[PDB]
PDB file of all heavy atoms in Angstrom:
ATOM      1  N   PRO B 163      26.436  22.013 -48.038  1.00  2.00           N
ATOM      2  CA  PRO B 163      26.126  23.359 -48.578  1.00  2.00           C
ATOM      3  C   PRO B 163      24.754  23.374 -49.399  1.00  2.00           C
ATOM      4  O   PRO B 163      24.209  24.382 -49.414  1.00  2.00           O
ATOM      5  CB  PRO B 163      27.305  23.619 -49.508  1.00  2.00           C
ATOM      6  CG  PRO B 163      28.364  22.769 -48.982  1.00  2.00           C
ATOM      7  CD  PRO B 163      27.773  21.509 -48.534  1.00  2.00           C
ATOM      8  N   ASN B 172       9.749  27.064 -50.798  1.00  2.00           N
ATOM      9  CA  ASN B 172       9.662  27.832 -51.940  1.00  2.00           C
ATOM     10  C   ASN B 172      10.644  27.396 -53.067  1.00  2.00           C
ATOM     11  O   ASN B 172      10.565  27.951 -54.142  1.00  2.00           O
ATOM     12  CB  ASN B 172       9.796  29.255 -51.629  1.00  2.00           C
ATOM     13  CG  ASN B 172      11.217  29.674 -51.291  1.00  2.00           C
ATOM     14  OD1 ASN B 172      11.799  29.159 -50.347  1.00  2.00           O
ATOM     15  ND2 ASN B 172      11.787  30.544 -52.088  1.00  2.00           N
ATOM     16  N   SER B 179      10.699  27.399 -61.765  1.00  2.00           N
ATOM     17  CA  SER B 179      10.750  28.600 -62.593  1.00  2.00           C
ATOM     18  C   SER B 179      12.109  28.656 -63.423  1.00  2.00           C
ATOM     19  O   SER B 179      12.049  29.045 -64.552  1.00  2.00           O
ATOM     20  CB  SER B 179      10.708  29.809 -61.704  1.00  2.00           C
ATOM     21  OG  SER B 179      11.865  30.117 -60.974  1.00  2.00           O
ATOM     22  N   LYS B 185       8.862  33.760 -65.409  1.00  2.00           N
ATOM     23  CA  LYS B 185       9.461  34.848 -64.605  1.00  2.00           C
ATOM     24  C   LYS B 185       8.413  35.756 -63.882  1.00  2.00           C
ATOM     25  O   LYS B 185       8.702  36.760 -63.356  1.00  2.00           O
ATOM     26  CB  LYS B 185      10.358  35.787 -65.524  1.00  2.00           C
ATOM     27  CG  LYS B 185      11.615  35.072 -65.958  1.00  2.00           C
ATOM     28  CD  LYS B 185      12.222  35.760 -67.187  1.00  2.00           C
ATOM     29  CE  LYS B 185      13.497  36.549 -66.855  1.00  2.00           C
ATOM     30  NZ  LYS B 185      14.602  36.206 -67.710  1.00  2.00           N
ATOM     31  N   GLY B 186       7.090  35.249 -63.939  1.00  2.00           N
ATOM     32  CA  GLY B 186       6.018  35.922 -63.294  1.00  2.00           C
ATOM     33  C   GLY B 186       6.145  35.751 -61.798  1.00  2.00           C
ATOM     34  O   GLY B 186       7.054  35.191 -61.168  1.00  2.00           O
ATOM     35  N   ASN B 188       6.206  34.562 -58.097  1.00  2.00           N
ATOM     36  CA  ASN B 188       6.780  33.245 -57.675  1.00  2.00           C
ATOM     37  C   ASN B 188       6.435  33.140 -56.246  1.00  2.00           C
ATOM     38  O   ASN B 188       7.085  33.820 -55.379  1.00  2.00           O
ATOM     39  CB  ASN B 188       8.268  33.324 -57.918  1.00  2.00           C
ATOM     40  CG  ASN B 188       8.869  31.922 -57.818  1.00  2.00           C
ATOM     41  OD1 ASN B 188       8.803  31.246 -56.811  1.00  2.00           O
ATOM     42  ND2 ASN B 188       9.614  31.493 -58.920  1.00  2.00           N
ATOM     43  N   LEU B 189       5.366  32.480 -55.952  1.00  2.00           N
ATOM     44  CA  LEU B 189       4.679  32.513 -54.620  1.00  2.00           C
ATOM     45  C   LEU B 189       4.627  31.111 -54.199  1.00  2.00           C
ATOM     46  O   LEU B 189       4.555  30.140 -54.864  1.00  2.00           O
ATOM     47  CB  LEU B 189       3.279  33.087 -54.869  1.00  2.00           C
ATOM     48  CG  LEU B 189       3.178  34.305 -55.774  1.00  2.00           C
ATOM     49  CD1 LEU B 189       1.815  34.698 -56.149  1.00  2.00           C
ATOM     50  CD2 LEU B 189       3.883  35.613 -55.119  1.00  2.00           C
ATOM     51  N   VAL B 192       2.211  27.672 -47.421  1.00  2.00           N
ATOM     52  CA  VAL B 192       2.721  26.653 -46.520  1.00  2.00           C
ATOM     53  C   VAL B 192       1.628  26.426 -45.396  1.00  2.00           C
ATOM     54  O   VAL B 192       1.869  26.157 -44.278  1.00  2.00           O
ATOM     55  CB  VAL B 192       4.059  27.137 -45.895  1.00  2.00           C
ATOM     56  CG1 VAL B 192       3.841  28.459 -45.043  1.00  2.00           C
ATOM     57  CG2 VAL B 192       4.787  26.065 -45.156  1.00  2.00           C
ATOM     58  N   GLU B 204      -4.046  31.175 -54.565  1.00  9.59           N
ATOM     59  CA  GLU B 204      -3.177  32.312 -54.771  1.00  9.59           C
ATOM     60  C   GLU B 204      -2.872  32.516 -56.223  1.00  9.59           C
ATOM     61  O   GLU B 204      -2.891  33.721 -56.685  1.00  9.59           O
ATOM     62  CB  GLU B 204      -1.890  32.118 -53.978  1.00  9.59           C
ATOM     63  CG  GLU B 204      -1.173  33.430 -53.720  1.00  9.59           C
ATOM     64  CD  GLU B 204      -0.007  33.361 -52.709  1.00  9.59           C
ATOM     65  OE1 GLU B 204       0.408  32.240 -52.338  1.00  9.59           O
ATOM     66  OE2 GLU B 204       0.509  34.447 -52.375  1.00  9.59           O
ATOM     67  N   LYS B 207      -6.076  34.176 -57.588  1.00 10.52           N
ATOM     68  CA  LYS B 207      -6.092  35.570 -57.265  1.00 10.52           C
ATOM     69  C   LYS B 207      -5.093  36.462 -58.037  1.00 10.52           C
ATOM     70  O   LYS B 207      -5.444  37.527 -58.460  1.00 10.52           O
ATOM     71  CB  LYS B 207      -5.830  35.739 -55.750  1.00 10.52           C
ATOM     72  CG  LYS B 207      -6.879  35.219 -54.718  1.00 10.52           C
ATOM     73  CD  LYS B 207      -6.288  35.579 -53.334  1.00 10.52           C
ATOM     74  CE  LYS B 207      -7.316  35.028 -52.240  1.00 10.52           C
ATOM     75  NZ  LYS B 207      -6.562  34.961 -50.942  1.00 10.52           N
ATOM     76  N   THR B 208      -3.873  35.920 -58.230  1.00 12.17           N
ATOM     77  CA  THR B 208      -2.857  36.624 -58.966  1.00 12.17           C
ATOM     78  C   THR B 208      -3.350  36.873 -60.391  1.00 12.17           C
ATOM     79  O   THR B 208      -3.216  38.087 -60.851  1.00 12.17           O
ATOM     80  CB  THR B 208      -1.607  35.865 -58.975  1.00 12.17           C
ATOM     81  OG1 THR B 208      -1.123  35.615 -57.660  1.00 12.17           O
ATOM     82  CG2 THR B 208      -0.472  36.568 -59.706  1.00 12.17           C
ATOM     83  N   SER B 236       3.483  10.589 -32.613  1.00 23.99           N
ATOM     84  CA  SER B 236       3.464  11.171 -31.261  1.00 23.99           C
ATOM     85  C   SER B 236       2.161  11.822 -30.890  1.00 23.99           C
ATOM     86  O   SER B 236       1.829  11.850 -29.655  1.00 23.99           O
ATOM     87  CB  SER B 236       4.654  12.205 -31.197  1.00 23.99           C
ATOM     88  OG  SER B 236       4.885  12.552 -29.862  1.00 23.99           O
ATOM     89  N   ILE B 237       1.412  12.316 -31.823  1.00 24.20           N
ATOM     90  CA  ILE B 237       0.033  12.809 -31.570  1.00 24.20           C
ATOM     91  C   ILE B 237      -1.065  11.844 -31.824  1.00 24.20           C
ATOM     92  O   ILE B 237      -2.226  12.206 -31.812  1.00 24.20           O
ATOM     93  CB  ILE B 237      -0.114  14.155 -32.331  1.00 24.20           C
ATOM     94  CG1 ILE B 237      -0.255  13.999 -33.778  1.00 24.20           C
ATOM     95  CG2 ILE B 237       1.020  15.150 -32.039  1.00 24.20           C
ATOM     96  CD1 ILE B 237      -0.398  15.331 -34.639  1.00 24.20           C
ATOM     97  N   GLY B 296     -10.552  30.365 -41.482  1.00 30.34           N
ATOM     98  CA  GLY B 296      -9.924  29.853 -40.386  1.00 30.34           C
ATOM     99  C   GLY B 296     -10.946  29.479 -39.297  1.00 30.34           C
ATOM    100  O   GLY B 296     -11.864  30.143 -39.079  1.00 30.34           O
ATOM    101  N   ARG B 313     -18.118  27.379 -43.692  1.00 36.46           N
ATOM    102  CA  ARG B 313     -17.905  28.715 -44.198  1.00 36.46           C
ATOM    103  C   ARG B 313     -17.118  28.716 -45.492  1.00 36.46           C
ATOM    104  O   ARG B 313     -17.505  29.422 -46.443  1.00 36.46           O
ATOM    105  CB  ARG B 313     -17.407  29.647 -43.129  1.00 36.46           C
ATOM    106  CG  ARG B 313     -18.292  29.945 -42.108  1.00 36.46           C
ATOM    107  CD  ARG B 313     -17.674  31.022 -41.171  1.00 36.46           C
ATOM    108  NE  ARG B 313     -16.733  30.471 -40.266  1.00 36.46           N
ATOM    109  CZ  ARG B 313     -15.423  30.743 -40.196  1.00 36.46           C
ATOM    110  NH1 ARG B 313     -14.873  31.704 -40.943  1.00 36.46           N
ATOM    111  NH2 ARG B 313     -14.610  30.071 -39.306  1.00 36.46           N
ATOM    112  N   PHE B 428      -3.826  21.876 -40.128  1.00 45.14           N
ATOM    113  CA  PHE B 428      -3.363  22.187 -38.712  1.00 45.14           C
ATOM    114  C   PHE B 428      -3.464  23.748 -38.642  1.00 45.14           C
ATOM    115  O   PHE B 428      -3.031  24.450 -39.543  1.00 45.14           O
ATOM    116  CB  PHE B 428      -2.039  21.736 -38.243  1.00 45.14           C
ATOM    117  CG  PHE B 428      -2.042  20.289 -37.900  1.00 45.14           C
ATOM    118  CD1 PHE B 428      -0.844  19.639 -37.561  1.00 45.14           C
ATOM    119  CD2 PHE B 428      -3.186  19.512 -37.877  1.00 45.14           C
ATOM    120  CE1 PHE B 428      -0.802  18.316 -37.287  1.00 45.14           C
ATOM    121  CE2 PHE B 428      -3.179  18.128 -37.528  1.00 45.14           C
ATOM    122  CZ  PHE B 428      -1.955  17.595 -37.276  1.00 45.14           C
ATOM    123  N   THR B 431      -6.880  26.123 -40.758  1.00 37.36           N
ATOM    124  CA  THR B 431      -6.980  26.804 -42.037  1.00 37.36           C
ATOM    125  C   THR B 431      -7.635  25.966 -43.111  1.00 37.36           C
ATOM    126  O   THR B 431      -7.248  24.755 -43.249  1.00 37.36           O
ATOM    127  CB  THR B 431      -5.568  27.255 -42.465  1.00 37.36           C
ATOM    128  OG1 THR B 431      -5.630  27.881 -43.812  1.00 37.36           O
ATOM    129  CG2 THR B 431      -4.590  26.079 -42.634  1.00 37.36           C
TER     130      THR B 431
ATOM    131  N   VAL C 133       9.897  11.680 -29.640  1.00 66.39           N
ATOM    132  CA  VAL C 133       9.473  12.884 -30.384  1.00 66.39           C
ATOM    133  C   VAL C 133       8.369  13.479 -29.664  1.00 66.39           C
ATOM    134  O   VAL C 133       7.310  12.859 -29.392  1.00 66.39           O
ATOM    135  CB  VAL C 133       9.085  12.482 -31.794  1.00 66.39           C
ATOM    136  CG1 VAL C 133       8.399  13.671 -32.517  1.00 66.39           C
ATOM    137  CG2 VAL C 133      10.385  12.150 -32.599  1.00 66.39           C
ATOM    138  N   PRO C 135       5.087  15.311 -28.537  1.00 61.61           N
ATOM    139  CA  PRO C 135       3.774  15.543 -29.298  1.00 61.61           C
ATOM    140  C   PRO C 135       3.635  16.913 -29.782  1.00 61.61           C
ATOM    141  O   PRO C 135       3.079  17.105 -30.934  1.00 61.61           O
ATOM    142  CB  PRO C 135       2.757  15.246 -28.143  1.00 61.61           C
ATOM    143  CG  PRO C 135       3.443  14.302 -27.202  1.00 61.61           C
ATOM    144  CD  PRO C 135       4.843  14.712 -27.222  1.00 61.61           C
ATOM    145  N   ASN C 144       2.856  28.018 -40.883  1.00 64.82           N
ATOM    146  CA  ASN C 144       1.523  28.581 -40.799  1.00 64.82           C
ATOM    147  C   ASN C 144       0.930  28.596 -39.405  1.00 64.82           C
ATOM    148  O   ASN C 144      -0.094  29.257 -39.195  1.00 64.82           O
ATOM    149  CB  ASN C 144       0.581  27.815 -41.709  1.00 64.82           C
ATOM    150  CG  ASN C 144       0.194  26.393 -41.239  1.00 64.82           C
ATOM    151  OD1 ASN C 144       1.013  25.576 -41.049  1.00 64.82           O
ATOM    152  ND2 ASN C 144      -1.072  26.192 -40.896  1.00 64.82           N
ATOM    153  N   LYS C 157     -11.355  34.741 -37.938  1.00 64.31           N
ATOM    154  CA  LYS C 157     -11.809  33.537 -38.645  1.00 64.31           C
ATOM    155  C   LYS C 157     -11.827  33.701 -40.178  1.00 64.31           C
ATOM    156  O   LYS C 157     -12.324  32.951 -40.790  1.00 64.31           O
ATOM    157  CB  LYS C 157     -13.222  33.171 -38.149  1.00 64.31           C
ATOM    158  CG  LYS C 157     -13.246  32.896 -36.674  1.00 64.31           C
ATOM    159  CD  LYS C 157     -14.711  32.673 -36.264  1.00 64.31           C
ATOM    160  CE  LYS C 157     -14.633  31.621 -35.011  1.00 64.31           C
ATOM    161  NZ  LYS C 157     -16.060  31.472 -34.477  1.00 64.31           N
ATOM    162  N   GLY C 158     -11.286  34.872 -40.625  1.00 62.89           N
ATOM    163  CA  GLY C 158     -11.190  35.042 -42.100  1.00 62.89           C
ATOM    164  C   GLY C 158     -10.057  34.229 -42.746  1.00 62.89           C
ATOM    165  O   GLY C 158      -9.582  33.276 -42.076  1.00 62.89           O
ATOM    166  N   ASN C 160      -6.872  32.490 -43.667  1.00 63.47           N
ATOM    167  CA  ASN C 160      -5.743  32.200 -42.890  1.00 63.47           C
ATOM    168  C   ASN C 160      -4.692  31.678 -43.847  1.00 63.47           C
ATOM    169  O   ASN C 160      -4.662  30.486 -44.289  1.00 63.47           O
ATOM    170  CB  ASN C 160      -6.064  31.175 -41.788  1.00 63.47           C
ATOM    171  CG  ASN C 160      -5.056  31.102 -40.614  1.00 63.47           C
ATOM    172  OD1 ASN C 160      -3.932  30.985 -40.882  1.00 63.47           O
ATOM    173  ND2 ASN C 160      -5.515  31.244 -39.472  1.00 63.47           N
ATOM    174  N   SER C 162      -0.467  31.908 -45.530  1.00 62.12           N
ATOM    175  CA  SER C 162       0.997  31.736 -45.139  1.00 62.12           C
ATOM    176  C   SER C 162       1.862  31.689 -46.362  1.00 62.12           C
ATOM    177  O   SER C 162       1.763  30.829 -47.196  1.00 62.12           O
ATOM    178  CB  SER C 162       1.248  30.622 -44.244  1.00 62.12           C
ATOM    179  OG  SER C 162       1.907  30.960 -43.042  1.00 62.12           O
ATOM    180  N   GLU C 176      -0.131  39.151 -50.209  1.00 48.41           N
ATOM    181  CA  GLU C 176      -1.231  38.260 -50.214  1.00 48.41           C
ATOM    182  C   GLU C 176      -2.480  38.839 -49.431  1.00 48.41           C
ATOM    183  O   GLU C 176      -3.595  38.641 -49.786  1.00 48.41           O
ATOM    184  CB  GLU C 176      -0.840  36.909 -49.695  1.00 48.41           C
ATOM    185  CG  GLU C 176      -1.971  35.868 -49.885  1.00 48.41           C
ATOM    186  CD  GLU C 176      -1.531  34.325 -49.847  1.00 48.41           C
ATOM    187  OE1 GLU C 176      -0.616  34.116 -49.135  1.00 48.41           O
ATOM    188  OE2 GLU C 176      -2.157  33.566 -50.585  1.00 48.41           O
ATOM    189  N   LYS C 179      -4.032  41.494 -51.758  1.00 50.73           N
ATOM    190  CA  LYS C 179      -4.862  40.778 -52.734  1.00 50.73           C
ATOM    191  C   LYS C 179      -6.181  40.284 -52.184  1.00 50.73           C
ATOM    192  O   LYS C 179      -7.231  40.360 -52.720  1.00 50.73           O
ATOM    193  CB  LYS C 179      -4.101  39.569 -53.311  1.00 50.73           C
ATOM    194  CG  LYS C 179      -2.856  39.946 -54.235  1.00 50.73           C
ATOM    195  CD  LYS C 179      -2.359  38.696 -54.842  1.00 50.73           C
ATOM    196  CE  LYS C 179      -1.145  38.982 -55.720  1.00 50.73           C
ATOM    197  NZ  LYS C 179      -0.264  37.758 -55.723  1.00 50.73           N
ATOM    198  N   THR C 180      -6.181  39.776 -50.962  1.00 52.65           N
ATOM    199  CA  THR C 180      -7.438  39.184 -50.369  1.00 52.65           C
ATOM    200  C   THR C 180      -8.502  40.266 -50.081  1.00 52.65           C
ATOM    201  O   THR C 180      -9.576  40.039 -50.396  1.00 52.65           O
ATOM    202  CB  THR C 180      -7.050  38.404 -49.140  1.00 52.65           C
ATOM    203  OG1 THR C 180      -6.056  37.423 -49.336  1.00 52.65           O
ATOM    204  CG2 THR C 180      -8.260  37.814 -48.455  1.00 52.65           C
ATOM    205  N   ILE C 209      27.591  27.651 -46.970  1.00 52.75           N
ATOM    206  CA  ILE C 209      27.552  28.304 -48.367  1.00 52.75           C
ATOM    207  C   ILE C 209      28.198  29.695 -48.277  1.00 52.75           C
ATOM    208  O   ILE C 209      27.978  30.506 -49.196  1.00 52.75           O
ATOM    209  CB  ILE C 209      26.097  28.465 -48.834  1.00 52.75           C
ATOM    210  CG1 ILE C 209      25.168  29.147 -47.895  1.00 52.75           C
ATOM    211  CG2 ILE C 209      25.604  27.021 -49.214  1.00 52.75           C
ATOM    212  CD1 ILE C 209      23.897  29.614 -48.616  1.00 52.75           C
ATOM    213  N   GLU C 266       5.592  41.696 -57.855  1.00 76.61           N
ATOM    214  CA  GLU C 266       6.105  40.382 -57.635  1.00 76.61           C
ATOM    215  C   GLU C 266       6.689  39.792 -58.956  1.00 76.61           C
ATOM    216  O   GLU C 266       6.055  39.970 -60.006  1.00 76.61           O
ATOM    217  CB  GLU C 266       5.134  39.418 -57.054  1.00 76.61           C
ATOM    218  CG  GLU C 266       4.031  40.020 -56.166  1.00 76.61           C
ATOM    219  CD  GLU C 266       2.845  39.075 -55.842  1.00 76.61           C
ATOM    220  OE1 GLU C 266       1.997  38.864 -56.756  1.00 76.61           O
ATOM    221  OE2 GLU C 266       2.893  38.511 -54.761  1.00 76.61           O
ATOM    222  N   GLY C 268       9.821  36.748 -60.456  1.00 76.40           N
ATOM    223  CA  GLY C 268      10.872  35.729 -60.372  1.00 76.40           C
ATOM    224  C   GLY C 268      12.041  35.850 -61.303  1.00 76.40           C
ATOM    225  O   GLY C 268      11.778  36.226 -62.483  1.00 76.40           O
ATOM    226  N   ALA C 270      14.060  33.339 -62.360  1.00 75.60           N
ATOM    227  CA  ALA C 270      14.304  32.064 -63.204  1.00 75.60           C
ATOM    228  C   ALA C 270      15.708  32.085 -63.640  1.00 75.60           C
ATOM    229  O   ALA C 270      16.020  31.689 -64.826  1.00 75.60           O
ATOM    230  CB  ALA C 270      13.346  32.029 -64.381  1.00 75.60           C
ATOM    231  N   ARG C 285      11.923  44.424 -62.362  1.00 86.79           N
ATOM    232  CA  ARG C 285      10.481  44.329 -62.860  1.00 86.79           C
ATOM    233  C   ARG C 285       9.553  44.424 -61.661  1.00 86.79           C
ATOM    234  O   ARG C 285       8.519  45.029 -61.835  1.00 86.79           O
ATOM    235  CB  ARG C 285      10.314  42.945 -63.544  1.00 86.79           C
ATOM    236  CG  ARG C 285      11.078  42.851 -64.898  1.00 86.79           C
ATOM    237  CD  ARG C 285      10.888  41.486 -65.543  1.00 86.79           C
ATOM    238  NE  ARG C 285      11.657  40.396 -65.119  1.00 86.79           N
ATOM    239  CZ  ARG C 285      11.273  39.237 -64.566  1.00 86.79           C
ATOM    240  NH1 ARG C 285      10.036  39.087 -64.249  1.00 86.79           N
ATOM    241  NH2 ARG C 285      12.206  38.375 -64.186  1.00 86.79           N
ATOM    242  N   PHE C 400      15.836  33.316 -51.778  1.00 66.63           N
ATOM    243  CA  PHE C 400      16.378  32.173 -52.511  1.00 66.63           C
ATOM    244  C   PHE C 400      15.253  31.619 -53.490  1.00 66.63           C
ATOM    245  O   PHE C 400      14.150  31.712 -53.148  1.00 66.63           O
ATOM    246  CB  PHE C 400      16.878  31.066 -51.591  1.00 66.63           C
ATOM    247  CG  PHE C 400      18.187  31.414 -50.873  1.00 66.63           C
ATOM    248  CD1 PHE C 400      18.743  30.491 -50.056  1.00 66.63           C
ATOM    249  CD2 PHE C 400      18.886  32.495 -51.304  1.00 66.63           C
ATOM    250  CE1 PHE C 400      20.042  30.696 -49.431  1.00 66.63           C
ATOM    251  CE2 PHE C 400      20.071  32.798 -50.644  1.00 66.63           C
ATOM    252  CZ  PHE C 400      20.639  31.868 -49.777  1.00 66.63           C
ATOM    253  N   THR C 403      12.919  34.792 -55.944  1.00 67.18           N
ATOM    254  CA  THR C 403      11.623  35.433 -55.841  1.00 67.18           C
ATOM    255  C   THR C 403      11.676  36.785 -55.198  1.00 67.18           C
ATOM    256  O   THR C 403      12.283  37.024 -54.138  1.00 67.18           O
ATOM    257  CB  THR C 403      10.737  34.493 -54.958  1.00 67.18           C
ATOM    258  OG1 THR C 403       9.325  35.024 -54.873  1.00 67.18           O
ATOM    259  CG2 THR C 403      11.324  34.330 -53.555  1.00 67.18           C
TER     260      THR C 403
END
Side-chain angles (χ1 to χ4, degrees):
Chain B
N172 72 299
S179 72
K185 293 160 107 131
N188 196 299
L189 319 165
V192 68
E204 201 171 5
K207 291 185 185 159
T208 301
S236 193
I237 69 184
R313 287 185 282 120
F428 283 177
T431 175
Chain C
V133 165
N144 73 296
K157 307 176 142 169
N160 196 309
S162 232
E176 188 161 32
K179 289 189 183 149
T180 302
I209 55 164
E266 332 169 278
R285 294 185 270 120
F400 281 178
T403 182

